[PDB]
Design a protein around this ligand. Sequence first.
Ligand SMILES: Nc1nccc(-c2ccccc2)n1
Length: 154
Amino acid sequence: ASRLYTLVLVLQPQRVLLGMKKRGFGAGRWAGFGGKVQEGETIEDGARRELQEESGLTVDALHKVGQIVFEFVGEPELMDVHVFCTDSIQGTPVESDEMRPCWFQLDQIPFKDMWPDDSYWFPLLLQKKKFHGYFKFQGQDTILDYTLREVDTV
Ligand SMILES: Nc1nccc(-c2ccccc2)n1
């Protein structure tokens, strides 16, 4: 019914790293780093791998911050996105053919050029709150319905 994905936010005291995807799902938007979890791989190991593949950064500890289920009307598979954050990274962000990373000051997060759901849950991430969310999309731009609640255990 649902497919596992990861999403990683590199969140430091005064800035956050986002990546501009050049192609595929979500191209043209700033977003966290992530993708599909593989066979035999833990969700956290998948999150660490995708962060390296897409940003060039090596993460140690990842902290669970949320879970968001996305439904796209007309598509059978739900996306079960496990969201993580970290403030301890090594390496410097790498631009590739697939992704352009850039740091943003927290007061300059580019919500108009991000997925629309981020405007709801990013403020929770910034205040170190954990959450469970569900967003029903029509296409890539329109949220038909959603739920979002803070939780103690992701
Ligand atoms: N912010 C946002 N909105 C919609 C979808 C996603 C997503 C993230 C990781 C993997 C698959 C989808 N992220």
